[PDB]
Design an enzyme around this catalytic site. Structure first.
Site, PDB file in Angstrom:
ATOM      1  N   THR A 255       1.298  -1.278   0.065  1.00  0.00           N
ATOM      2  CA  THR A 255       0.297   0.411  -0.106  1.00  0.00           C
ATOM      3  C   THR A 255       0.874   1.687  -0.188  1.00  0.00           C
ATOM      4  O   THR A 255       1.759   1.284   0.089  1.00  0.00           O
ATOM      5  CB  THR A 255      -0.926  -0.091   1.197  1.00  0.00           C
ATOM      6  OG1 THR A 255      -0.908   0.310   2.661  1.00  0.00           O
ATOM      7  CG2 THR A 255      -1.537  -1.175   1.387  1.00  0.00           C
ATOM      8  N   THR A 256       0.199   2.303  -0.318  1.00  0.00           N
ATOM      9  CA  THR A 256       0.614   3.545  -0.332  1.00  0.00           C
ATOM     10  C   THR A 256       1.339   4.485   0.980  1.00  0.00           C
ATOM     11  O   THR A 256       0.522   4.293   2.151  1.00  0.00           O
ATOM     12  CB  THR A 256       0.440   5.060  -1.088  1.00  0.00           C
ATOM     13  OG1 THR A 256      -0.325   4.136  -2.362  1.00  0.00           O
ATOM     14  CG2 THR A 256       1.253   5.474  -1.822  1.00  0.00           C
TER      15      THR A 256
END
Lengths: 250, 231, 195, 240, 243, 241, 244, 235, 111
Positions: free
Chosen positions: E30-31
């Site tokens: 994920t970011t």
């Protein structure tokens, strides 16, 4: 982590060969030619200083190394491997001999210790053999002068004269024609320079050639006076000027 | 394929197959469910036998008076990991006179499982765990995966056909979370949850395993005639 | 422990060793055999610290027997004595040294000669015509300096040994409850039952 | 330390390094044990592709572990020295702590346990050796013969053989050994042993070794002539 | 070939394919981002809500080291925790011997050397995380990003994970539009905007926003999680910008 | 062909892992250059900061190993820093053990010895880096010594490293053919730095802004790196001539 | 991990042979032949140097024949470097025994321990075996004169006459032919040199390609003397038997 | 090759699975639990007639209240038994009481997964552990090299197991007398055995609260064999 | 020189009836001629109906009680919640004490 390579990297092939030792000798073949000649009153060891760049200062790179005051070494093959072998060799002449007997080891025994170190790189866990053949020249009171060749396997042989490396085959043949058992040190130096010129291609002078001798004691190189029994090193490195003097009467 | 020989190898798309293969052992395991309210946390486990002559493999283990878990996959690996938790809970009590926070219990398991995924010679743990507890911040439920990933949840399920119970709990979320001060109802919800994962077999008296912990209830396990109430 | 003696004669080595085991103000035993057979033609007596003595004796005995079984051969008395000396010489710089004094009586079959070695706990080895450990030496050495001859028979040796026990039973402060006498010769080791 | 698991399970459930260690045994020279009514006899083949040998100093095929127990083997000779040494050391250690020499069963159980350890330790290969261990328990006159093998299993035998062509000599012993009546004397037992080797050996010259163990540490090795008399006698009865 | 089967082996290119493979694991994650500001740093991360059953606010991903450093990472989460656990051990031994809390550049090299060490041998695996981290020390604010190879640099802004490119573009605008500097409270808002904008590359599952910060004026140089009113304010600002 | 995966000899007596580690050297696509003055030793290196998000002040391949020794690296930054930490530690220990500052050539030898070990020992890979060490040695004077993954090392009159090293090397060779001396015959380090940049410009055929370069300068009793403005001041001086 | 590069030096072939030992023996079969012959009044050791160069220093050289103690010597076939490792262990072992028991070490005991070391490298540790075969020649007061041989397997045997290294098959046949038990040292010297001369891969056997030694009781009364032959003494003994 | 502790793609440990194949080659061992006691029986299976069968020891005492039978690579069981005995005696030394059969079995199973790259491979033997304690009465446990143990009312292990287990499924009930169990083990062993069952190639044993663990004489088992043959002929 | 032992005073007393047992102890804790606490309990319920007191040097007393309490906990974990009988507790406490034979817990113990 930790060295998980606790097993031999050199092992016997069905034919009997020890692959890595063979391949190490191949590296030594590719190496620049070095030679040694034994005279009655001394030994000469020589080699070409193959410069890696003209911006390099080849004086900062010593191919011929003092091991004890009466022993010197030169090689053919891989430089870095030789360098650490010299460090180790110099130390073992102290730990396993000088620190015990209060004197420097005789050539055959120092040679024996180096050969042990190289043998162990052939059998121990997680190491390749050394990629060098050494020529060790030296003197000691009870054996006189002597010249030895140590191969990657750990084998060592005493020589009257020999060469190792690039053009060794031709150089050895040259040395067979010229060697006799009455050679004086200055006659051995003269033959060493002649033999080297055949294998050297480019410049041939005191800056491209490295050459040392095992001969008389040098009291001027001792650095002190007052002890009669201490008379100075028999190992001496010929200067760039001392080589060119002999290249005129060549 | 060529990258599944050991845990220390990454595949070209960045996968660890040995960890995935460990994850697969969990999938073959017998279904276990975990759910909680604000006062109690409840494990429910379907036990599995070898045949009609054998006992039913125990799925639930007590860790401390306030903590415990259920297992799905390699049972010896659960015994190792539970034993580790027992020591960690115990250390906290003896040294700090403090009950180990269920959250810290998760962090400790994560880090123990992780080390077995980065070194040569080791293997990943081949078991999934559902940890329930009651500590200074109330009731909790955790899901442990041997990849190292630990996740706090209102409810969940791991094992074969766990997707049924997991869907059910997702629908029932708003109902069961507010079953406060009523143990038997929270268990009923968990027993109905695990019933969505059954095929050809139904919940019997030597088949069903239930555990509960909460505000005024030490972690206790129910087997045999004590679960007959819930069939 | 206390009294161990040894006399080498023409054809044999005779070892006499006191039978008492005293602890505190009680003589706990009056028939103790302070000797081990290391090999068919080698016998070792011992005296010193309680526990240490028998432990060392049996340890040596096991090693010599192990050697025997390995090589199908009996070590010479000289060889055994040198092994035993070295073990004690090691021991004296250990964290807890063996406080044991031994005599080794053997018959070298290759040489056809009796041999007697005195070794103390420090590992001080000497070959002797006659030997003693502890306070016994203070009465027996002078006695044997006078009466001993190098060409004596086993019987003469035993009479010479009787003279030593007698002197010790007259002048020594403690009751050592007599001695067990054993003879080492060409035919091996045997015990004199009536002494 | 070298750690590699060399002995492992294959898909079919075999430990190939243990099984290949058995092939080394199968290559070794035949060894046979036969127990009588009051004795055990250990017979051993010695291959004759080796002339110019010195039989005074060459390692004998039957070794004494203690004064009352003996050990013969089939397989790798170098390997067998390690087993014998350990056995001999345990023999002395047992006498030290128990104040009694080892039983033949115990000594065999120890030797087999060592062998087994080398089948599930890291960094070692199994012993390429099977042993025949024979003798008499302290203060006992009942004959004892045991056999071990690389896996670590051991058992008691009325008569047994190991090594090359051992299946041929086992066949012979299986029809020529009566459990109801074992070789009532030393002579009978040596003969049955010599006969069984003659099925496989070649010449009964310096090819056969015979060691006779009797109760109370009574072990003696037969000389060439003594054995040759058995060879000579057996052949004359055969021409019939 | 087979050069990619063992860590620490050079390919003929001069590359360590196993590290490059670990980078693939990071790109999958994920970011997460980091924004450097006037007197500090701000960290934010995307928490994919896999299911309704996840307890909100209760699977915290941003971690503190010592009392002044914050760490966030993308990729294999357990691998990131291992790296922080070391980071804490390193920081503690620094504070033990030298008294002063570990400076951020010093702390950056501690993690760097440790991660670099896991590229030296075939008996360990590289880290499956890129880690954005930073804080405030005696020389002001520092932001760093560390990659599986052991490579790290100082950053004005930093981004990693599935939405790294989206986030990077958005970071670059801020750097261009604010040459003088961004305020701590502003950066918190911007972080929320960027995570929402970077969520477009992961838009199947909706997510939970998590923000932390260190600021010399706002948090007194100590690491603090952004919660409650400040968080909801930052969320709202972000929501307004996507529409 | 596992002989290509670990540092054992190939049939032709070669070490491929060492060879491939040499190729890792150019992975950064950066060129470096060292020269010597009378009083100083100047090292320069390209500085390429592609990403606008990077803090440019933290991007560096020049390291201050000790007060007197500086080192520029050609190769990936993780390996580069690994080398730099070891060098610092080695130089610190030498001083504590032997009572005097570690010479540049001795540190070079030591680091080269470590590198050699990785070419012989199997569990340790070579570092994909070439290390150039610079100082003004209290005995030998201005000094440039350079290490590679083979464990080779040698002193230089001047040197270059990187993808376009041969162009810079010949450029320097041709200058020293002309000048007939071993160094830059200049009093101030400022002009030696200017010489270094001038001859890099010619050989690479590119122009440099203040942020395209990195400069380390060793003088007696200290090695220091230059700021962007120090380099800018230097760039202005070159342009106005 | 490192498993990939493990040769597994200490494993069995499906046939129950030890690969590395077999391959080491194959290596030894190319090493220069060495012969040992035991007579009733002494032992001869003879060995052929590996293809010599004229510039080799022949007198200050040792390659084949080494002295373990005053009563025991060994002939070497294989890698010399491997042999010295073992020779030094053997030399120390002999001294240990002397220091322990105050008697020179019985030959077999020394041969067993050296053979045991070899055995270990074939069963555990993952290292290559020593590529060496020894011929032991020695004396002790138990068995008198003794010849032994050990090889990389760690197996050792006793001989009246034996060869190792190259052409053992031919050499053994020849020794089997002309050896008899009542033989004397000087007869054995001849047999040794004759055999090498017929089995050599060289054109003709010369003094510079040989090492030679005898272990006699030919000192003065009941004591043993080791004679490592000098170059000139080999030159003379080669003429005395009419080979040159 | 590959790591010793490697998972298959189906989530199983290769070496554990392969050791289970080694056990299927082993000789049959059957255990039946009753309220009067637990019976343990094994097929001796002598490889040759010259081998003295009574030296084959596949039923073993762990303590007075615990016994054990084995199947597979039986040499592997020696250290398992040695551990079991020490575990049992040690617990008595620390607590002045008998150790629970389940606690014993869990202790033995703790050795099982202690392999990898600890021992080099899993055990190649399965154990039937049969005993009595005051808490849970008579118990029979099947201990596998996986580290897993199940309690059984009856269980067969070895080559004839799947056939013998199917038979045990039909024959077992909760009211079997010790004598009934003894005969049942003999009957089912006779069925799956290769050679014809007698007192020399099969062995019986039992554990009872009163008399503890006892291996039966060849004379005692011979009479049970005779009683069995007579009963089958009697309908 | 550092003396690792101290004397915290107090006294304890145990009596057994036909179906009960009492374990009494005063609550005073001292060092030299001073009172540390008028109420510091040194008689404890250790679970499984076992009460225990280790009187003498309180630091050793507390350490022992702490270890035995922890022993009871693990006994349950390892033996299916089985009750630890008093005779088994006694035997366990012997090993707890003797384990420090050469650096003893300086206490009189009664359960």
């Amino acid at each position: 982590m930790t060295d998980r390579y606790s097993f031999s990297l050199t092992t016997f092939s069905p034919s009997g060969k020890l692959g890595q030792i063979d391949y190490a000798l191949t590296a030594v073949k590719q190496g620049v030619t070095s030679l040694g000649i034994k005279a009655t009153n001394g030994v000469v060891i020589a080699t070409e200083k193959k410069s890696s760049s003209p911006l390099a200062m080849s004086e900062t790179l010593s191919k011929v190394s003092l091991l004890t005051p009466d022993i010197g070494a030169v090689y053919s093959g891989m430089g870095p491997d030789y360098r650490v072998l010299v460090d180790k060799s110099r130390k073992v002449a102290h730990t396993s001999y000088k620190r015990i007997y209060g004197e420097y080891p005789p050539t055959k025994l120092l040679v024996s210790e180096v050969a042990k170190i190289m043998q162990e790189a052939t059998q121990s866990g997680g190491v390749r053999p050394f990629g060098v053949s050494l020529l060790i020249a030296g003197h000691d009171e009870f054996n006189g002068f002597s010249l030895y060749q140590v191969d990657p396997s750990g084998s060592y042989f005493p020589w009257k004269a020999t060469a190792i490396g690039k053009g060794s085959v031709a150089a050895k043949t040259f040395l067979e024609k010229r060697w006799n058992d009455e050679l004086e040190l200055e006659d051995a130096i003269h033959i060493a320079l002649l033999t080297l010129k055949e294998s050297v291609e480019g410049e041939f002078n005191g800056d491209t050639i490295e050459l040392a001798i095992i001969g008389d004691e040098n009291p001027d190189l001792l650095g002190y006076t007052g002890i009669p029994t201490d008379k100075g090193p028999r190992f001496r490195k010929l200067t760039s000027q001392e080589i060119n003097d002999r290249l005129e009467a060549l | 394929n060529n990258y599944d020989g050991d845990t220390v190898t990454f595949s070209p798309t960045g996968r660890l197959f040995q960890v995935e293969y460990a994850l697969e052992a969990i999938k073959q395991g017998s279904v276990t469910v975990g759910l909680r309210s604000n006062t109690h946390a409840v494990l429910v486990a379907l036990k599995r036998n070898a045949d009609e002559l054998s006992s039913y493999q125990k799925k639930i283990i007590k860790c401390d008076e306030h903590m415990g878990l259920s297992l799905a996959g390699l049972a010896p690996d659960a015994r190792v990991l539970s034993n580790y938790l027992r020591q960690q809970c115990n250390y906290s009590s003896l040294v700090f006179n403090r009950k180990l926070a269920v959250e810290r219990a998760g962090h400790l398991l994560c880090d123990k499982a992780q080390k077995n995924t980065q070194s040569y010679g080791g293997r990943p743990y081949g078991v999934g765990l559902l940890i329930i507890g009651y500590d200074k911040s109330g009731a909790h439920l955790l899901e442990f995966q041997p990849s190292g990933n630990v996740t706090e949840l209102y409810g969940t399920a791991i094992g074969a056909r766990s997707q049924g119970a997991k869907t059910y709990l997702e629908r029932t979320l708003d109902t069961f979370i507010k079953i406060d001060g009523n143990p038997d109802e929270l268990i009923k919800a968990g027993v109905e949850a695990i019933s969505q994962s059954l095929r050809d077999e139904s919940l019997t008296v030597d088949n069903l395993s239930i555990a509960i912990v909460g505000k005024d209830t030490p972690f206790t396990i129910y087997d045999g005639e004590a679960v007959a109430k819930y069939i | 422990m206390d009294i161990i003696l040894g006399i080498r004669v023409q054809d044999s080595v005779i070892l006499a060793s006191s039978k008492a085991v005293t602890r505190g103000i009680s003589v706990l035993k009056d028939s103790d055999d302070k000797t081990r057979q290391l090999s068919p033609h080698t016998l070792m007596s011992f005296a010193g610290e309680a526990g240490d003595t028998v432990q060392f004796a049996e340890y040596i005995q096991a090693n010599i027997q192990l050697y025997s079984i390995r090589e199908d051969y009996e070590l010479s008395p000289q060889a055994v004595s040198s092994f035993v000396r070295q073990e004690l010489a090691k021991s004296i710089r250990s964290r807890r040294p063996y406080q044991v004094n031994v005599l080794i009586g053997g018959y070298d079959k290759k040489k056809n000669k009796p041999e007697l070695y005195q070794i103390d706990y420090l590992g001080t080895k000497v070959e002797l015509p006659y030997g003693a450990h502890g306070y016994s030496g203070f009465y027996t050495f002078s006695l044997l300096d006078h009466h001993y001859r190098p060409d004596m028979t086993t019987e003469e040796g035993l009479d010479l040994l009787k003279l030593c026990v007698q002197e010790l039973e007259k002048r020594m402060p403690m009751d050592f409850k007599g001695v067990i006498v054993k003879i080492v010769d060409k035919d091996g080791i045997r015990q004199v039952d009536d002494f | 330390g070298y750690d590699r698991a060399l002995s492992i399970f294959s898909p079919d459930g075999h430990i190939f390094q243990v099984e290949y260690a058995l092939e080394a045994v199968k290559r070794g020279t035949c060894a046979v044990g036969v127990k009588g009514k009051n004795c055990v006899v250990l017979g051993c083949e010695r291959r004759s592709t080796l002339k110019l040998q010195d039989t005074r100093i060459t390692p004998s095929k039957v070794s004494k572990i203690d004064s009352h127990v003996v050990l013969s083997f089939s397989g790798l000779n170098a390997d067998s020295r390690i087993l014998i040494e350990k056995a001999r050391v345990e023999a002395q250690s047992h006498r030290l702590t128990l104040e009694d020499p080892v039983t033949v069963e115990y000594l065999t159980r120890y030797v087999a346990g060592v062998q087994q350890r080398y089948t599930q330790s890291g960094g070692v290969r199994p012993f390429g050796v099977s042993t025949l261990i024979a003798g008499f328990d302290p203060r006992d006159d009942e004959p004892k013969l045991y056999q071990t093998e690389p896996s670590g299993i051991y058992s008691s035998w009325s008569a047994q053989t190991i090594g090359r062509n051992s299946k041929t000599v086992r066949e012979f012993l299986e029809k020529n050994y009566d459990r109801k009546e074992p070789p009532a004397t030393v002579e009978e037992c040596v003969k049955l042993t010599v006969r069984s080797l003659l099925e496989v050996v070649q010449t009964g010259a310096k090819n056969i070794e015979i060691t006779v163990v009797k109760p109370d540490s009574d072990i003696v090795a037969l000389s060439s002539e003594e054995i040759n008399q058995y060879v000579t006698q057996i052949e004359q009865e055969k021409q019939e | 070939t087979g050069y990619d089967l063992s860590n620490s082996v050079f390919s003929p290119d001069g590359r360590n394919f196993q590290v490059e493979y670990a980078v693939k694991a990071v790109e999958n994650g994920t970011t997460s981002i980091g924004i450097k500001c006037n007197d500090g740093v701000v960290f934010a991360v995307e928490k994919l809500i896999t299911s309704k059953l996840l307890v909100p606010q209760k699977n915290v991903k941003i971690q503190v080291v010592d009392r002044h450093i914050g760490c966030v990472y993308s990729g294999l989460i357990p691998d990131g925790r291992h790296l922080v656990n070391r980071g804490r051990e390193e920081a503690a031994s620094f504070k033990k011997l030298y008294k002063t809390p570990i400076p951020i550049p010093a702390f950056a090299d501690r993690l760097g050397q440790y991660v670099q060490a896991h590229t030296l041998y075939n008996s360990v695996r590289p880290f499956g995380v890129s880690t954005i981290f930073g804080g405030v020390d005696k020389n002001g604010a520092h932001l760093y990003m560390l990659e599986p190879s052991g490579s790290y640099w100082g950053y004005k802004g930093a981004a990693t994970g599935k939405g790294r490119q989206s986030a990077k573009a958005e970071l670059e605008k801020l750097v261009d539009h604010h040459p003088e500097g961004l305020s701590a409270r502003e950066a918190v808002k911007q972080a929320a905007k960027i995570i929402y904008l970077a969520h477009e590359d992961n838009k199947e599952k909706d997510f939970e926003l998590e923000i932390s910060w260190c600021s010399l004026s706002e948090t007194n140089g100590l690491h603090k999680f952004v919660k409650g009113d400040l968080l909801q304010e930052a969320i709202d600002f972000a929501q307004k910008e996507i529409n | 062909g596992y002989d290509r995966h670990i540092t054992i000899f190939s049939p032709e007596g070669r070490l491929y892992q060492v060879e491939y580690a040499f190729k890792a050297t150019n992975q950064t696509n950066i060129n470096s250059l060292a020269v010597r003055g009378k009083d100083c030793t100047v090292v320069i290196s390209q500085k390429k900061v592609p990403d606008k998000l990077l803090d440019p002040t933290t991007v560096s391949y020049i390291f201050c190993i000790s007060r007197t020794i500086g080192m520029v690296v050609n190769g990936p930054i993780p390996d580069a820093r690994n080398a730099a930490l070891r060098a610092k530690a080695e130089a610190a220990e030498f001083r504590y053990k032997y009572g005097y500052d570690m010479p540049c050539d001795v540190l070079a030898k030591r680091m080269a010895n470590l590198s050699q070990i990785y070419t012989q020992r199997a569990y340790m890979r070579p570092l994909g880096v070439i290390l150039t060490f610079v100082s003004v040695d209290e005995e030998l004077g201005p000094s440039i010594y350079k290490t590679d993954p083979a464990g080779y090392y040698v002193g230089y009159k001047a040197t270059a490293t990187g993808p376009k090293q041969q162009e810079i090397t010949t450029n320097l060779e041709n200058h020293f053919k002309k000048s007939k001396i071993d160094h830059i015959n200049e009093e101030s380090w400022e002009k030696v730095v200017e010489f270094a940049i001038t001859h890099m410009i010619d050989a690479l055929g590119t122009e440099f802004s203040k942020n395209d370069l990195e400069v380390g300068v060793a003088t007696k009793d200290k090695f220091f790196t230059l700021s962007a403005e120090n380099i800018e001041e230097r760039l202005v001086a070159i342009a106005e001539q | 991990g490192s498993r990939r590069y493990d040769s597994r030096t200490t494993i069995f072939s499906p046939e129950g042979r030890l690969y590395q030992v077999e391959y080491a023996l194959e290596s030894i079969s190319h090493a220069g032949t060495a012969i040992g012959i035991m007579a009733s009044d002494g032992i001869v050791l003879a060995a052929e140097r590996k293809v010599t160069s004229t510039l080799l220093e022949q007198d200050t050289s040792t390659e084949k024949l080494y002295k373990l103690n005053d009563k025991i010597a060994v002939a070497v076939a294989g890698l010399t470097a491997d042999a010295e490792i073992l020779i030094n262990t053997a030399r120390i072992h002999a001294q240990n025994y002397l220091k322990t028991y105050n008697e020179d070490i019985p030959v077999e005991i020394l041969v067993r321990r050296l053979s045991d070391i070899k055995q270990g490298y074939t069963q555990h540790g993952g290292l290559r075996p020593f590529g060496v075969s020894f011929i032991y020649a020695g004396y002790d007061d138990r068995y008198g004169y003794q010849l032994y041989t050990s090889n990389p397997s760690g197996n050792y045997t006793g001989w009246k006459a034996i060869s190792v290294g190259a052409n053992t098959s031919a050499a053994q046949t020849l020794l089997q032919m002309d050896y008899k038990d009542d033989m004397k040292v000087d007869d054995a010297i001849e047999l040794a040199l004759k055999t090498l001369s017929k089995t050599t891969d060289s054109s003709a056997l010369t003094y510079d390609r040989l090492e030679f030694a005898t272990i006699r009781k030919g000192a003065n009364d009941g004591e043993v003397y080791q004679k490592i032959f000098k170059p000139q003494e080999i030159k003379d003994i080669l003429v005395k038997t009419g080979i040159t | 090759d590959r790591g010793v502790s490697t998972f298959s793609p189906e989530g199983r440990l290769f070496q554990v699975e392969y050791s289970l194949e080694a056990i299927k080659l082993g000789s049959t061992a059957i255990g039946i639990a009753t309220k009067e006691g637990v019976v343990l029986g094994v097929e001796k299976r002598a490889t040759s007639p010259l081998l003295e069968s009574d030296s084959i020891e596949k039923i073993v005492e762990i303590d007075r209240h615990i016994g054990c039978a084995m199947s597979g690579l039986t040499a592997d069981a020696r250290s398992m038994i040695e551990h079991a005995r020490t575990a049992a005696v040690t617990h008595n030394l620390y607590y002045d009481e008998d150790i629970n059969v389940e606690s014993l079995t869990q202790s033995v199973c703790d050795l099982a997964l202690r392999f990898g790259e600890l021992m080099s491979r899993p055990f190649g033997v399965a154990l039937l552990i049969a005993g009595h304690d005051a808490d849970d009465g008579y118990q029979l446990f099947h201990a596998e090299p996986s580290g897993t143990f199940y309690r059984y009312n009856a269980k067969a292990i070895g080559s004839g197991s799947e056939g013998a287990q199917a038979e045990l499924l039909n024959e077992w009930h909760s009211s079997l007398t010790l004598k009934e169990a003894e005969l049942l083990v003999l009957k089912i062993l006779k069925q799956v055995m290769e050679e014809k069952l007698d007192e020399n190639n099969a062995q019986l044993s039992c554990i009872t609260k009163q008399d503890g663990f006892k291996i039966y004489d060849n004379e005692k088992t011979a009479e049970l064999i005779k009683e069995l043959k007579e009963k089958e002929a009697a309908e | 020189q550092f003396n690792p032992y101290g004397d915290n005073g107090g006294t304890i007393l145990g009596i057994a009836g036909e179906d009960f047992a009492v374990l009494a102890g005063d609550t005073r804790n001292i060092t030299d001629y001073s009172i540390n606490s008028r109420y510091e309990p040194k008689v404890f319920d250790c679970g499984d109906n076992i009460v225990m007191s280790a009187n003498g040097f309180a630091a050793d007393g507390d350490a022992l009680v702490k270890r035995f309490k922890n022993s009871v906990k693990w006994y349950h974990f390892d033996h299916n919640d089985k009750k630890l009988s008093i005779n088994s507790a006694a035997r366990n406490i012997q090993h707890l004490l003797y384990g420090k034979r050469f650096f003893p817990y300086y206490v009189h113990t009664i359960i």
